């Protein structure tokens, strides 16, 4: 129908302009996030190496965070998007976390879930899992202090023995089109960084007390590192999803446009043949 096709061409044209608008704005945010993250990359090297060197050099394993223990029960931290329209980003991290728990844990009680992102909480509310902590509505660019208090809650749950082992599941930014669903172990610190270059350190703070400061500061540092990669990878995923969406829409506009022109030329050859058919008879 000529009237109907014209509506679709007009709708596809308008929605192509919005997909392009979200492609360009995602580019601007990605550029900033790589810059902001690279600003905390030097901070991360400084803190993580000095605290590792004092934790692993000139001393034994005498911290609950350093020492390995047999695992009575465990937790998972999974970090996901608030809004949608980013393609495969949420599914491929949820796919790894869901497959991992069921395959290697055989009791609901065995595992607990910490979640960042509305889509993660939604997936857990559907199906069925419990959630111990479920932070949401973070700003587009994260600050350290947002997860200062939330991390404080998580390290309290670990440090008092509620969970004996804890894993992070998040996306890692590698390339402009390729991003990698990955898992790392936040606690215990069964392994540690080693600069191999150390200097005499003050022996006045109690070693356990001195650690009491540096272990949580390392833990917070690791979690924030995951947010830097997570937010950067979310913005890139929306940008290609928007590039491909716009390219599909513009292709559909040329295909639809030709159907309209073929229909328009047939309607003008029918009306002229009916007119001339009556005129020839009379």
């Amino acid at each position: 129908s000529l009237r109907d096709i014209k509506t679709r061409i007009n709708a596809t044209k308008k929605t192509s302009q919005i997909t392009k608008a979200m492609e360009m704005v995602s580019t601007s945010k990605l550029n900033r996030a790589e810059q902001n993250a690279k600003s905390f990359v030097p901070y991360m090297e400084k803190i993580q190496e000095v605290v590792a060197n004092v934790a692993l050099g000139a001393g034994g394993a005498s911290h609950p965070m350093l020492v390995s223990r047999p695992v009575k029960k465990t937790g998972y931290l999974v970090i996901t998007s608030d809004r949608g329209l980013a393609g495969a980003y949420n599914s491929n991290v949820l796919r790894l976390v869901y497959q991992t728990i069921q395959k290697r844990h055989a009791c609901p009680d065995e595992y607990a879930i910490i979640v960042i992102g509305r889509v993660g909480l939604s997936f857990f509310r559907k199906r069925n899992m419990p959630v111990i902590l479920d932070i949401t509505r973070l700003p587009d660019q994260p600050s350290f202090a947002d997860i200062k208090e939330i991390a404080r809650k998580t390290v309290g749950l670990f440090a008092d023995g509620t969970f004996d082992e804890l894993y992070m599941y998040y996306n890692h930014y590698v390339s402009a089109i390729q991003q990698e669903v990955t898992e790392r172990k936040l606690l215990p610190l069964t392994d540690l960084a080693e600069n191999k270059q150390r200097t005499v350190y003050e022996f006045e703070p109690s070693q356990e007390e001195c650690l009491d400061v540096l272990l949580p500061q390392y833990a917070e540092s690791l979690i924030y590192g995951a947010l830097l990669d997570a937010k950067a990878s979310e913005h890139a995923a929306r940008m290609t999803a928007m590039k491909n969406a716009t390219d599909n829409a513009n292709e559909l506009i040329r295909t639809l446009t030709l159907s309209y022109n073929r229909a328009r030329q047939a309607a003008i050859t029918q009306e002229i043949t009916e007119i001339v058919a009556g005129a020839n008879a009379l």
């Binding site: 007009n10 709708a11 308008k14 929605t15 809004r83 949608g84």
Partner: protein, 119 residues
Amino acid sequence: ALAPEIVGEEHYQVARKVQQTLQRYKELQDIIAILGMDELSDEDKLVVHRARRIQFFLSQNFHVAEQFTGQPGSYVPVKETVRGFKEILEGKYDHLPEDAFRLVGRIEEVVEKAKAMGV
């Protein structure tokens, strides 16, 4: 007869303002149908909110629809129609659920119809 002096300034203001709301809802429906409603801004959300209510509140229970819909019917005087449509546009009645605005005559009735639903 929709001219500022033929119907009055208060009437004309409300009438054209309704016509902006419903034209904005028409273009926005294309974006909702393909991309989804949650993707959009607070002002776009508030347009869709009000436009749904305005469009259903244009429906009415007639006496000749006594045969077609059971319910008896209503006559709304003009002064009342202007008051009510002004309240919808200013947001006073936005708490009520949208199904309450279908086939009702005066805005007073819409408040009670909602009470039966339980709101």
